[PDB]
RNA sequence: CGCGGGGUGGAGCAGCCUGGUAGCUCGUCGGGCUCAUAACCCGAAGGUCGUCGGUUCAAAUCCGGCCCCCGCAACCA
RNA sequence: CGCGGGGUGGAGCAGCCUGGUAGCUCGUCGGGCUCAUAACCCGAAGGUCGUCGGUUCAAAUCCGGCCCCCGCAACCA
RNA sequence: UGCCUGGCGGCCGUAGCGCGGUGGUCCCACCUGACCCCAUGCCGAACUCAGAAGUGAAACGCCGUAGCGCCGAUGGUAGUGUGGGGUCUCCCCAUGCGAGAGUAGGGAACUGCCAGGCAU
RNA sequence: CGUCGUAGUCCGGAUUGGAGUCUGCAACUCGACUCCAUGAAGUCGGAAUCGCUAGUAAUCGUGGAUCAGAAUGCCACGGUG
RNA sequence: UCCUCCUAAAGAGUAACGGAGGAGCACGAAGGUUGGCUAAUCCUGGUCGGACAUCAGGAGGUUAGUGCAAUGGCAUAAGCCAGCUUGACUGCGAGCGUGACGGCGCGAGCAGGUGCGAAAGCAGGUCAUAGUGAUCCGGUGGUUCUGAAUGGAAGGGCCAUC
RNA sequence: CCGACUUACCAACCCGAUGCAAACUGCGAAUACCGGAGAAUGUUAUCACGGGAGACACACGGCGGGUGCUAACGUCCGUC
C-alpha cells in the first residue's frame, strides 16, 4: 500500500516538473536499498544511474540501505554529474518529505555539484 | 513518544489472592492490591454450578416419599 | 409566469483556435470550465481561465488517465 | 511484555501445530486495542467532557483523543463538528501489557460475570464486548469518581475468518467459553 | 388512472415525437396493438382501454402498457391569449409512436384479441393494427 | 451591511491607506497585521483607522 | 459623521452631581391572619451596578476603547 | 381568475418576527368541603402544529401542490 | 543474448475487473531496537532512522480463461442542405453527407531506456 | 452501658423470590405466624378540615369476644404523661 | 441592476410573458506560498446508542464536498486539518471575446520587495460565475499643481474614501 | 418475554426483461464554425479614413422551441 499511496502523493510534483521541463534529480529510497538517477525534463531518457546496487558503491559501503550510503551515493552521483557536465536541476523529492536519507543525500548532491 | 501529556508509565508490583506477583507496567506506580484474577476465577469449575437449576422430581423425592 | 431568467451570457467557449496564430500575450480559450487544460507550454489564471504562454499553431489532443481534453503546443 | 514473550515463544508454536500453515507468518495477528466511551452530555457540559477525558487518560496509558461530530443529526440534538465521542488506540507492548491487565484484573471484577459472547467478532474476527462500569478497573478509583462511565473493548484482528480468530483467542485462552 | 407520483418538473415543453419510433417490437404479452400514425393517448384513454380489456377478458390473463403520461402537458383553458406567459397545467398524455405496442393481452384467443383491439380503435381516435410477439 | 468598512493606514507615517471591512458583531478585535506602503517602498505594520 | 440623555436584580423608578453607601412599586416563594383572589407587615433568593482598560486604600461616579435605544440644525452625490 | 392571511390537546388563542424554548384559559380525571349539588380551593392526564412533498442537522416557523374559509381585486368599450 | 526486480518515456480501460497457479540468487515490503535525526490535535499506529533472525499471509510481478466493461463489424439507419412533390400536426423523389444502435467477430496487453542476480 | 449521626440511614419494613409449624378431613380461588434475602416511597404533607380541659389527646402494653385457626379491628383493663 | 441551467441552427449569442432556485456579500481566517488526508452510502458487533451521535471489519470511488441558488470544474483535487504569513503589497509592461464605446471577464514580463520554503516554485486573496449603481462636486486624509506685482500661503487639482 | 408455523398481499435489491427526456450524453454526428497547405474564377465584392442617408414598424415558399388545440394569410422567434 505504501508504493501506491506514495505514487499518488507524488503525482502532482512529478507531473509538475515533467510539464515544467526542467531536468529533475529523482530519488526513491527503500529500507534495504535505493536507486538514484538524473532524468530528462520530459522523462524519456536518464543521464546518470548510480545506486547502492552498483559493484563499487555496494562494496565500499557497509550497509546498502542506510542514510550514510545515501550520502555517499549523493556525493558520487553529483560528482559524476559534474564529470558529464550537469549544472542546473530543479529538485523533486518524489513525494517524500525533505528529511532523513533524502535530506542527507540531497545535501551530498549540493556539496558535490548540483545547485539547489 | 509524548513524555509530557501522558501520565506516568512504569513497572509496578501487584499481588492477587493466589499470591502471583505480576511484574507488569501500570500508570499508578505504587503497589496494587486486587481481589480475584483469572487464575483463581471460578470460570472453569463454578460456572456449571452457577446454573443451580436443580430438579423438581429430585426435590420432591428427597423432601418426602410415597 | 415568474421564472424567465438567464445569464447575461459571458461569451465563453473556445475563441482562438488551433491553427490560428497567437500574438504576443494572446489567449487560446476563454471558458468557465477546465474542459481544455494547460498541457505543454500553457498556463492558468485565477477564475478558471487559461492563457497559453507559447505561440504558434496550437495542438488539440486528449490525454490523462481520466480521458481529459487538453490544449498543447506544436513547433511553429 | 510477558504476553509479548508468550506470543513470540509458545503461542506461535501452538498455532503452528494447530493450523499447519506452510508460511510462518500466515497466522492472523491482533494489531490494536480500542476502548470506547460515548458521552452525549458533551454539549451540556464540556467540563464533564474534560473530566471524563481525564478519567480515560488515567485508566489508559495514553490520553484519549476527542473526536468531532462526523455528520449532523437532528434526533440526537448535537451539532456537526462538536466533539461527541472519545477513543484510545494502542499498539505493541502497550497492547500486550494492557491486555494482560484486562484479562487478569477486569474480567473477575466484572459484576455478575457470566462469560462473554463468542459471536462478538464483528463478522470477521474483531472481538467486541462491553462492560458497564469504570470501577471494575484498578486505576480508576472508586472513592474519587462521582459519575460512573462505561466502555466496550473492541479489538480488530487480521483474521480471514471468525473461525481462525476464535482459534487464535482460544489458543491464547480468551475467556469466551 | 396512470399518472406519475412525482414528475421531474411541473411543466415541460410541448415536445416533438417525429420520425421513426423505438417501441417497434413486443415485449411482455402475446397480443398487441400497433399504431402506425401519430397522435396522443390521454391518461383517461389508457385507463379506459385497460378497463375495457379487463371487461372482455373477464379477468383472464394480464394487461401490459408501455407508454406513460409522464409528461403533464399545459394546454390553455379556453378564452386566454397566447401571451400571459406559458399556459396552465391541464392534463396528462403520451404521444403515438410508429410501431409501438400500446396494450397487451394473453390467455385468450386471437379472435378475442383482435376484437378487443378494434374496441381500442373504438375507444381511441388512433389508427391500429394487430400484432403478436415476434420469434427472436 | 453589518461588516463595517475600515481604512488601514500605515504606522510608517505615510498616508497611503487601503480599505477592507470587519464585522464588529462577530470579530471585534483590532485588525493587526504587517502591511506595505508604496511611498517608502518597504514593509511596515498597519493599524486600523476609522473611516470617519 | 458629532453632541446629549441614558443601559440600575425580572421590569421600570432611586445612587454617576467630582471616590469611602444595592433603596422604592410591583415579579416569586415562605410566614401571621381573615372563607379569602384581595389587604398590611416580616423574611429569603435575585444585580460582571451595558463591556474592557487607565489614577488609586477607596468606584457606578473621573476619562478612554466597543455595543444597544432615543432626542437632535443639517445634507442624503 | 390573481394578490394576502389562517388552519397547533376535547374548544378558543399564542409561540409565526425569521428555526432547537409544547405556553394561556376553559374543559375532563382524583380529591377536601357541602345536609346533597353548584361555586371554591388542592392534586393529574391530554397534541404527526390542516394536509401531501421539498430546503434545512433539524420547521409550525423557509418553499411548491391539495381542502376550506376570511378579505380584496376579478377591468374599458 | 533471456527470465525475475527496481528507477522513468510511447497507448491512457483491445491497458482496465475477475478466477485457476508461480518468486526469494537479485529483489520489495512484512519484520528486530526505535534510547537517536525526525511524528502524533492518543499510540515509531503513519512516516522514519541503526539492521537482516525469518518472511511471501496482504501486496507486487508473470502465464491461462474471453466470465465482465471496451473496440469496431458488413448489411442497415434517421436526419442536413440541395432542386421536385404530396397523402402538409407529418411523409416521400436524383445525388453529395451520413449518425447511432448493436451483432456474427478481437484484445488480459503491447513498447522503450538504464542497471542488479543469474550464462554464453 | 457499647454503636450510629440528618442521609432514604440497622429510620421505614414496604413490593417480592428460595424453605417450615399449626389449624382445618380438605390452605388454591378465599389463613396467619416464621428463616433468609429484595431493601420502595415517605423527609410532618396540599386544599379544606375531624375528635380532645385532666387522668384529658396521644403513646407502650394486657385481656376478651369473634374463632379450629385467619386483624391494626370493636369492647373492658392497665404503664407513662 | 446584478446571478444557476436547456434556448438558439453540436464556436458564439440570441426573446419577453419559452420551466425551476437567488444577492446588495462574508472568511484576517473558510486565506495564500508551503507540510498532510480523501468521500457518500449499507451489512456485522458492542454498556450507553434507537435507522442514524461514538467505536471497531467489510462493499463502491467522486454517486461526498463545495460559503451560498446552481451549473460547469475539480483526485494533482479549489473537497477534508495546519507551522510562516498578511500576495486580502505597490509603482509599471507587449496581448483576446463582448465589444457604440466605455471597458469589463483575460496579462509573458521591469522592479523594491515582503511572505514562504533547502530548493523547484510561487503567492497576482478565497473553485470562477449572484454580493451591485454615471458625471460632477463635496466630507475626507497621504501630493507644493497653478501660484491674480515680488517672497510666502490659500481655493479648484493626483494616491485612497464615502 | 424470546416465540412455532403459512399467506392468490406490497415491493427494497440483483438477475431475465420495458423504459425515457428543455433542463443527463460512459455514443457519435452532418452541412459547416474556426481555421491552416491549392485549379480556375471573380471590372477589388477586404481594410483605413472623411461628406451625407434611411429605417430601431419587413410579409409569404423550403427548418426546430414556448406557443397554440402536435390549428392558422398565427407568433417572440434563430433562418435561406
Ligand atoms: Mg420519439
Ligand atoms: Mg419547538
Ligand atoms: Mg427563541
Ligand atoms: Mg387518591
Ligand atoms: Mg358544586
Ligand atoms: Mg498468483
Ligand atoms: Mg513497516
Ligand atoms: Mg501473497
Ligand atoms: Mg449505423
Ligand atoms: Mg455504432
Ligand atoms: Mg482483456
Ligand atoms: Mg485478470
Ligand atoms: Mg431519608
Ligand atoms: Mg425519596
Ligand atoms: Mg431497613
Ligand atoms: Mg431475611
Ligand atoms: Mg382465633
Ligand atoms: Mg449553444
Ligand atoms: Mg446555431
Ligand atoms: Mg499541498
Ligand atoms: Mg446498527
Ligand atoms: Mg461557495
Ligand atoms: Mg483553496
Ligand atoms: Mg475558498
Ligand atoms: Mg510654487
Ligand atoms: Mg505672488
Ligand atoms: Mg490673489
Ligand atoms: Mg432525446
Ligand atoms: Mg437530454
Ligand atoms: Mg429579405
Ligand atoms: Mg417583427
Ligand atoms: Mg417549419
Ligand atoms: Mg429539440
Ligand atoms: Mg415555432
Ligand atoms: Mg404567419
Ligand atoms: Mg403557422
Ligand atoms: Mg422564414
Ligand atoms: Zn488470584
PDB file of C-alpha atoms in Angstrom, chain D residues 13-171:
ATOM      1  CA  UNK D  13       4.444 -22.711  18.159  1.00  0.00           C
ATOM      2  CA  UNK D  14       0.962 -23.684  19.366  1.00  0.00           C
ATOM      3  CA  UNK D  15      -0.669 -22.082  16.332  1.00  0.00           C
ATOM      4  CA  UNK D  16       1.906 -23.663  14.019  1.00  0.00           C
ATOM      5  CA  UNK D  17       0.877 -27.033  15.460  1.00  0.00           C
ATOM      6  CA  UNK D  18      -2.806 -26.096  15.102  1.00  0.00           C
ATOM      7  CA  UNK D  19      -3.033 -24.560  11.619  1.00  0.00           C
ATOM      8  CA  UNK D  20      -0.034 -26.168   9.838  1.00  0.00           C
ATOM      9  CA  UNK D  21       0.496 -23.065   7.703  1.00  0.00           C
ATOM     10  CA  UNK D  22       3.378 -23.602   5.280  1.00  0.00           C
ATOM     11  CA  UNK D  23       4.006 -19.861   5.617  1.00  0.00           C
ATOM     12  CA  UNK D  24       5.453 -18.982   9.008  1.00  0.00           C
ATOM     13  CA  UNK D  25       3.579 -15.694   9.423  1.00  0.00           C
ATOM     14  CA  UNK D  26       0.357 -16.701   7.617  1.00  0.00           C
ATOM     15  CA  UNK D  27      -1.347 -16.775  11.043  1.00  0.00           C
ATOM     16  CA  UNK D  28      -3.778 -13.890  11.657  1.00  0.00           C
ATOM     17  CA  UNK D  29      -2.434 -11.223  14.000  1.00  0.00           C
ATOM     18  CA  UNK D  30      -4.111  -8.980  16.547  1.00  0.00           C
ATOM     19  CA  UNK D  31      -2.746  -5.487  15.904  1.00  0.00           C
ATOM     20  CA  UNK D  32      -4.570  -2.903  18.066  1.00  0.00           C
ATOM     21  CA  UNK D  33      -6.771  -2.238  21.106  1.00  0.00           C
ATOM     22  CA  UNK D  34      -9.704   0.181  21.197  1.00  0.00           C
ATOM     23  CA  UNK D  35     -11.514   1.375  24.310  1.00  0.00           C
ATOM     24  CA  UNK D  36     -14.606   3.457  23.581  1.00  0.00           C
ATOM     25  CA  UNK D  37     -16.888   5.656  25.667  1.00  0.00           C
ATOM     26  CA  UNK D  38     -19.854   7.577  24.283  1.00  0.00           C
ATOM     27  CA  UNK D  39     -20.984  10.715  26.073  1.00  0.00           C
ATOM     28  CA  UNK D  40     -23.996  12.683  24.885  1.00  0.00           C
ATOM     29  CA  UNK D  41     -23.542  15.277  27.659  1.00  0.00           C
ATOM     30  CA  UNK D  42     -20.615  16.949  25.854  1.00  0.00           C
ATOM     31  CA  UNK D  43     -22.883  19.769  24.656  1.00  0.00           C
ATOM     32  CA  UNK D  44     -24.411  20.140  28.125  1.00  0.00           C
ATOM     33  CA  UNK D  45     -21.009  20.377  29.827  1.00  0.00           C
ATOM     34  CA  UNK D  46     -17.679  20.305  28.044  1.00  0.00           C
ATOM     35  CA  UNK D  47     -16.489  20.387  31.673  1.00  0.00           C
ATOM     36  CA  UNK D  48     -17.776  16.858  32.322  1.00  0.00           C
ATOM     37  CA  UNK D  49     -16.339  16.102  28.888  1.00  0.00           C
ATOM     38  CA  UNK D  50     -12.909  17.127  30.193  1.00  0.00           C
ATOM     39  CA  UNK D  51     -13.430  15.181  33.422  1.00  0.00           C
ATOM     40  CA  UNK D  52     -14.288  12.000  31.505  1.00  0.00           C
ATOM     41  CA  UNK D  53     -11.322  12.577  29.191  1.00  0.00           C
ATOM     42  CA  UNK D  54      -9.050  12.860  32.236  1.00  0.00           C
ATOM     43  CA  UNK D  55     -10.516   9.659  33.693  1.00  0.00           C
ATOM     44  CA  UNK D  56      -9.852   7.885  30.389  1.00  0.00           C
ATOM     45  CA  UNK D  57      -6.298   9.264  30.370  1.00  0.00           C
ATOM     46  CA  UNK D  58      -5.790   7.926  33.895  1.00  0.00           C
ATOM     47  CA  UNK D  59      -7.182   4.465  33.143  1.00  0.00           C
ATOM     48  CA  UNK D  60      -5.261   4.074  29.867  1.00  0.00           C
ATOM     49  CA  UNK D  61      -1.530   4.548  29.428  1.00  0.00           C
ATOM     50  CA  UNK D  62      -2.286   7.369  26.970  1.00  0.00           C
ATOM     51  CA  UNK D  63      -4.602  10.379  27.000  1.00  0.00           C
ATOM     52  CA  UNK D  64      -7.645   9.921  24.721  1.00  0.00           C
ATOM     53  CA  UNK D  65      -8.325  11.810  21.514  1.00  0.00           C
ATOM     54  CA  UNK D  66     -11.566  13.807  21.339  1.00  0.00           C
ATOM     55  CA  UNK D  67     -13.340  13.179  18.033  1.00  0.00           C
ATOM     56  CA  UNK D  68     -15.872  15.553  16.480  1.00  0.00           C
ATOM     57  CA  UNK D  69     -19.386  15.068  15.118  1.00  0.00           C
ATOM     58  CA  UNK D  70     -18.932  13.479  11.692  1.00  0.00           C
ATOM     59  CA  UNK D  71     -22.344  14.495  10.339  1.00  0.00           C
ATOM     60  CA  UNK D  72     -25.137  16.453  11.987  1.00  0.00           C
ATOM     61  CA  UNK D  73     -28.123  14.564  13.397  1.00  0.00           C
ATOM     62  CA  UNK D  74     -31.435  16.087  14.487  1.00  0.00           C
ATOM     63  CA  UNK D  75     -32.719  13.279  16.709  1.00  0.00           C
ATOM     64  CA  UNK D  76     -29.569  13.267  18.849  1.00  0.00           C
ATOM     65  CA  UNK D  77     -29.522  17.087  19.240  1.00  0.00           C
ATOM     66  CA  UNK D  78     -25.794  17.501  18.558  1.00  0.00           C
ATOM     67  CA  UNK D  79     -24.224  19.884  16.047  1.00  0.00           C
ATOM     68  CA  UNK D  80     -21.831  18.728  13.345  1.00  0.00           C
ATOM     69  CA  UNK D  81     -18.218  19.300  14.342  1.00  0.00           C
ATOM     70  CA  UNK D  82     -18.993  19.436  18.063  1.00  0.00           C
ATOM     71  CA  UNK D  83     -16.964  16.755  19.891  1.00  0.00           C
ATOM     72  CA  UNK D  84     -19.211  13.889  20.986  1.00  0.00           C
ATOM     73  CA  UNK D  85     -17.065  10.719  21.058  1.00  0.00           C
ATOM     74  CA  UNK D  86     -13.818   9.618  22.668  1.00  0.00           C
ATOM     75  CA  UNK D  87     -11.441   6.760  21.937  1.00  0.00           C
ATOM     76  CA  UNK D  88      -7.988   5.325  22.576  1.00  0.00           C
ATOM     77  CA  UNK D  89      -5.920   3.148  20.215  1.00  0.00           C
ATOM     78  CA  UNK D  90      -2.817   1.239  21.325  1.00  0.00           C
ATOM     79  CA  UNK D  91      -0.153  -0.997  19.775  1.00  0.00           C
ATOM     80  CA  UNK D  92       2.633  -3.426  20.529  1.00  0.00           C
ATOM     81  CA  UNK D  93       3.940  -3.646  24.086  1.00  0.00           C
ATOM     82  CA  UNK D  94       1.092  -1.377  25.176  1.00  0.00           C
ATOM     83  CA  UNK D  95      -1.333  -3.870  23.631  1.00  0.00           C
ATOM     84  CA  UNK D  96       0.276  -6.882  25.324  1.00  0.00           C
ATOM     85  CA  UNK D  97       0.574  -5.405  28.807  1.00  0.00           C
ATOM     86  CA  UNK D  98      -2.829  -3.695  28.841  1.00  0.00           C
ATOM     87  CA  UNK D  99      -4.381  -6.908  27.509  1.00  0.00           C
ATOM     88  CA  UNK D 100      -2.840  -8.838  30.401  1.00  0.00           C
ATOM     89  CA  UNK D 101      -4.147  -6.150  32.764  1.00  0.00           C
ATOM     90  CA  UNK D 102      -7.605  -6.626  31.243  1.00  0.00           C
ATOM     91  CA  UNK D 103      -7.657 -10.431  31.416  1.00  0.00           C
ATOM     92  CA  UNK D 104      -6.177 -10.663  34.924  1.00  0.00           C
ATOM     93  CA  UNK D 105      -7.956  -7.742  36.613  1.00  0.00           C
ATOM     94  CA  UNK D 106     -11.129  -6.578  34.885  1.00  0.00           C
ATOM     95  CA  UNK D 107     -12.667  -9.951  33.974  1.00  0.00           C
ATOM     96  CA  UNK D 108     -13.145 -11.144  37.592  1.00  0.00           C
ATOM     97  CA  UNK D 109     -14.016  -7.565  38.598  1.00  0.00           C
ATOM     98  CA  UNK D 110     -16.940  -7.503  36.140  1.00  0.00           C
ATOM     99  CA  UNK D 111     -20.033  -7.549  38.340  1.00  0.00           C
ATOM    100  CA  UNK D 112     -22.297 -10.549  37.668  1.00  0.00           C
ATOM    101  CA  UNK D 113     -19.861 -12.244  35.290  1.00  0.00           C
ATOM    102  CA  UNK D 114     -21.474 -14.935  33.121  1.00  0.00           C
ATOM    103  CA  UNK D 115     -18.914 -15.293  30.333  1.00  0.00           C
ATOM    104  CA  UNK D 116     -18.654 -13.239  27.165  1.00  0.00           C
ATOM    105  CA  UNK D 117     -20.355 -13.879  23.837  1.00  0.00           C
ATOM    106  CA  UNK D 118     -18.388 -15.984  21.360  1.00  0.00           C
ATOM    107  CA  UNK D 119     -20.109 -14.323  18.362  1.00  0.00           C
ATOM    108  CA  UNK D 120     -18.686 -10.862  19.170  1.00  0.00           C
ATOM    109  CA  UNK D 121     -16.350 -10.961  16.157  1.00  0.00           C
ATOM    110  CA  UNK D 122     -17.891  -8.138  14.071  1.00  0.00           C
ATOM    111  CA  UNK D 123     -18.492 -10.862  11.482  1.00  0.00           C
ATOM    112  CA  UNK D 124     -14.767 -11.246  10.713  1.00  0.00           C
ATOM    113  CA  UNK D 125     -12.923 -11.940  13.970  1.00  0.00           C
ATOM    114  CA  UNK D 126     -12.990  -8.486  15.617  1.00  0.00           C
ATOM    115  CA  UNK D 127     -13.793  -9.229  19.268  1.00  0.00           C
ATOM    116  CA  UNK D 128     -16.349  -6.726  20.564  1.00  0.00           C
ATOM    117  CA  UNK D 129     -17.860  -6.783  24.059  1.00  0.00           C
ATOM    118  CA  UNK D 130     -18.845  -4.129  26.591  1.00  0.00           C
ATOM    119  CA  UNK D 131     -18.644  -3.539  30.342  1.00  0.00           C
ATOM    120  CA  UNK D 132     -20.973  -1.050  32.000  1.00  0.00           C
ATOM    121  CA  UNK D 133     -18.753   0.386  34.761  1.00  0.00           C
ATOM    122  CA  UNK D 134     -15.383   2.034  35.424  1.00  0.00           C
ATOM    123  CA  UNK D 135     -14.782   0.789  38.981  1.00  0.00           C
ATOM    124  CA  UNK D 136     -14.046  -2.714  37.657  1.00  0.00           C
ATOM    125  CA  UNK D 137     -10.701  -1.196  36.558  1.00  0.00           C
ATOM    126  CA  UNK D 138      -7.802  -0.969  39.029  1.00  0.00           C
ATOM    127  CA  UNK D 139      -6.620   2.578  38.250  1.00  0.00           C
ATOM    128  CA  UNK D 140      -9.992   4.366  38.228  1.00  0.00           C
ATOM    129  CA  UNK D 141     -10.559   4.846  41.954  1.00  0.00           C
ATOM    130  CA  UNK D 142     -13.983   4.037  43.378  1.00  0.00           C
ATOM    131  CA  UNK D 143     -13.970   6.760  46.041  1.00  0.00           C
ATOM    132  CA  UNK D 144     -12.964   9.672  43.763  1.00  0.00           C
ATOM    133  CA  UNK D 145     -15.346   9.128  40.835  1.00  0.00           C
ATOM    134  CA  UNK D 146     -18.649  10.995  41.094  1.00  0.00           C
ATOM    135  CA  UNK D 147     -20.341   9.652  37.939  1.00  0.00           C
ATOM    136  CA  UNK D 148     -19.636   6.173  36.576  1.00  0.00           C
ATOM    137  CA  UNK D 149     -18.877   5.813  32.870  1.00  0.00           C
ATOM    138  CA  UNK D 150     -18.888   2.797  30.575  1.00  0.00           C
ATOM    139  CA  UNK D 151     -16.643   1.299  27.924  1.00  0.00           C
ATOM    140  CA  UNK D 152     -16.540  -1.503  25.358  1.00  0.00           C
ATOM    141  CA  UNK D 153     -13.256  -3.129  24.376  1.00  0.00           C
ATOM    142  CA  UNK D 154     -13.220  -3.879  20.659  1.00  0.00           C
ATOM    143  CA  UNK D 155     -10.114  -5.487  19.152  1.00  0.00           C
ATOM    144  CA  UNK D 156      -9.543  -5.729  15.393  1.00  0.00           C
ATOM    145  CA  UNK D 157      -7.794  -8.842  14.083  1.00  0.00           C
ATOM    146  CA  UNK D 158      -6.317  -9.614  10.664  1.00  0.00           C
ATOM    147  CA  UNK D 159      -8.248 -12.898  10.650  1.00  0.00           C
ATOM    148  CA  UNK D 160      -9.535 -14.071   7.291  1.00  0.00           C
ATOM    149  CA  UNK D 161     -12.381 -15.701   9.235  1.00  0.00           C
ATOM    150  CA  UNK D 162     -14.084 -15.594  12.608  1.00  0.00           C
ATOM    151  CA  UNK D 163     -13.176 -19.284  12.906  1.00  0.00           C
ATOM    152  CA  UNK D 164      -9.458 -18.519  12.803  1.00  0.00           C
ATOM    153  CA  UNK D 165      -9.949 -15.537  15.105  1.00  0.00           C
ATOM    154  CA  UNK D 166     -11.644 -17.827  17.620  1.00  0.00           C
ATOM    155  CA  UNK D 167      -8.844 -20.366  17.176  1.00  0.00           C
ATOM    156  CA  UNK D 168      -6.269 -17.666  17.973  1.00  0.00           C
ATOM    157  CA  UNK D 169      -8.158 -16.406  21.020  1.00  0.00           C
ATOM    158  CA  UNK D 170      -8.938 -19.879  22.405  1.00  0.00           C
ATOM    159  CA  UNK D 171      -5.296 -20.909  21.979  1.00  0.00           C
TER     160      UNK D 171
END
